């Protein structure tokens, strides 16, 4: 047949309720008069009554903000009877895709990441690994990726800048030179991540590296 | 529309119960999965649970026997709903018929009937009257 | 739209039946299961039988041998129905042309012509006249 | 194919025009945008302009009233094309039926009937005969 597309609705919508999404009509009305109703999931099945249908004009309706972490799709049947009380289409299926938005802050894999190292090793060495993650997309929208950071190594002595970290992978390495575990033999930095490359939200986290 | 024929069904059925009645689909599953559901008097309604469906096949049964007798019909509306939770398709009224069986003895009108006549009458003369009843099928 | 162009069927055909003359899909058919049926003369009406298709795959067939002489043409309307029990596709029409073969032998108008001419006249005189015909194409 | 089902309309109808009938949509749109159109008797042809189509969407609508009595079906024939310029699907017909509505009075066959009989016949002979017509349907 000629079908019906699917319907994109955005997440965290907000105005006045309701919202007409679309109108539907059977031709076969011009016999009696023919009553409109709809079923499935977020209709009659639970969650119940998130669309609903005017049995009279044809109308669907959005009743209410929706959250696609929650509920990312909806598959819908509807109806027409007549008022003598007999089916005169065959349902229709409808579909319902619901698009990502920015809702959600990143969160790092623990609380705390610990390391080590020893203290004569050659700058350009792999020492930690660091973990987080944003629920939002990540396939479409760069509402689910992350940019790893460094703010602030304790010890800001010998000298602050014994380390880096891979933005896009999070791994740690020796950048500098003059490790002592004779006189600083544990540092505590704090990292960040970021939404966007960077760009949106962030979060901190905390990783502790002690010197062989 | 391509409506859905009224089902006929006879009384007093009897078997192994559940009867499969009719499969029903919405297209529109291709998208979420759909939830079947179901209502009205037979259904939800009072006479509660004699019709179910299988939320996730789209199968009608009838669960027990019935006796046209007490209800001679039944009207149902179905729907389909999707997992995110919205209504797919505009709901679908749903019709059952149900056959007559001879279940039913006949009774008088009266337990009994009294009359009276002169007995000098003539041979092809009416008397009396009586009646009685049958409540099955007489159409 | 895009339609369906009308299928050429040789009459008399034969070979092993069926035979495969086309399919058809729906492409609302992301989410539910699709049902195709067929309707028309030569289809579930008188002609019954003549042609049939697979609800699953949208296969057409042809079951058996055709004479156009009997009918020479058919007209179909073809069907998409969901699991759930909505149509979704507005139907389509089908045509087949059945093409001439030569199966037929001719026939004399009558069974037997009379004529007459007199016995002077001169050569180069029309006399009689004769009938007959052949019921396959001459077109 | 699963083609598309006849569409029946009421006669005289009333309301708001237009009056959306049915939507229809190429798949083939992947690609480029398509082009609605629409062609026939009732459309581009002679009654022109009862229905038409929005080249964008699909829909098809009655613009105006209908009377059987002038012209009880209508066959189209819908199409869509790219915007390069390119036709993407086989044409599709399309019909239409006009459902008859109670609009006509009858009327006599003649305005005036005559007839005889002699004055002395038997009660139960049959004398006239008169006819009269309605041109509203009657099957
Ligand atoms: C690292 O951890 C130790 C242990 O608590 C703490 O005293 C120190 O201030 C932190 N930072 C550095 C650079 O040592
Ligand atoms: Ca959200
Ligand atoms: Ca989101
Ligand atoms: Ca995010
Ligand atoms: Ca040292
Ligand atoms: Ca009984
Ligand atoms: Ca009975
Ligand atoms: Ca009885
Ligand atoms: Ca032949
Ligand atoms: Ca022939
Ligand atoms: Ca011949
Ligand atoms: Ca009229
Ligand atoms: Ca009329
Ligand atoms: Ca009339």
Same mark, same amino acid.
């Given at each position: 047949d000629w079908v019906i597309p699917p319907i994109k609705v955005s997440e965290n919508e907000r105005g006045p309720f309701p919202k007409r999404l679309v109108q539907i009509k059977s031709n076969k009305d011009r016999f009696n008069k023919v009553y409109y109703s709809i079923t499935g999931q977020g209709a009659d099945n639970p969650?119940?009554?998130?669309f609903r249908i005017?049995? +009279? !004009?044809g109308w669907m309706l959005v009743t209410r903000p929706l959250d696609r972490e929650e509920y990312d799709k909806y598959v819908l049947s509807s109806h027409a009877v007549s008022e003598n009380g007999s089916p005169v289409e065959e349902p229709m299926e409808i579909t319902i895709n619901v698009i990502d938005q920015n809702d959600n802050r990143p969160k790092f894999t623990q609380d705390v990441f610990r390391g080590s190292v020893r203290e004569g090793v050659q700058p350009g060495t792999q020492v930690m690994a660091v973990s987080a993650t944003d629920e939002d997309d990540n396939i479409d929208s760069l509402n689910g990726v992350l940019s790893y950071s460094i703010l602030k190594q304790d010890? +800001? +002595?010998?000298?602050?800048?014994?380390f880096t970290i891979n933005? +896009? !992978?999070?791994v740690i390495s020796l950048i500098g030179t003059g490790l002592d575990r004779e006189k600083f033999p544990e540092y505590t930095l704090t990292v960040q991540a970021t939404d966007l490359e960077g760009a949106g939200l962030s979060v901190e986290g905390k990783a502790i590296i002690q010197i062989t």
């Open positions: 969650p119940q009554g998130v005017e049995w +009279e !004009t010890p +800001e +002595e010998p000298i602050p800048n014994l933005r +896009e !992978t999070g």
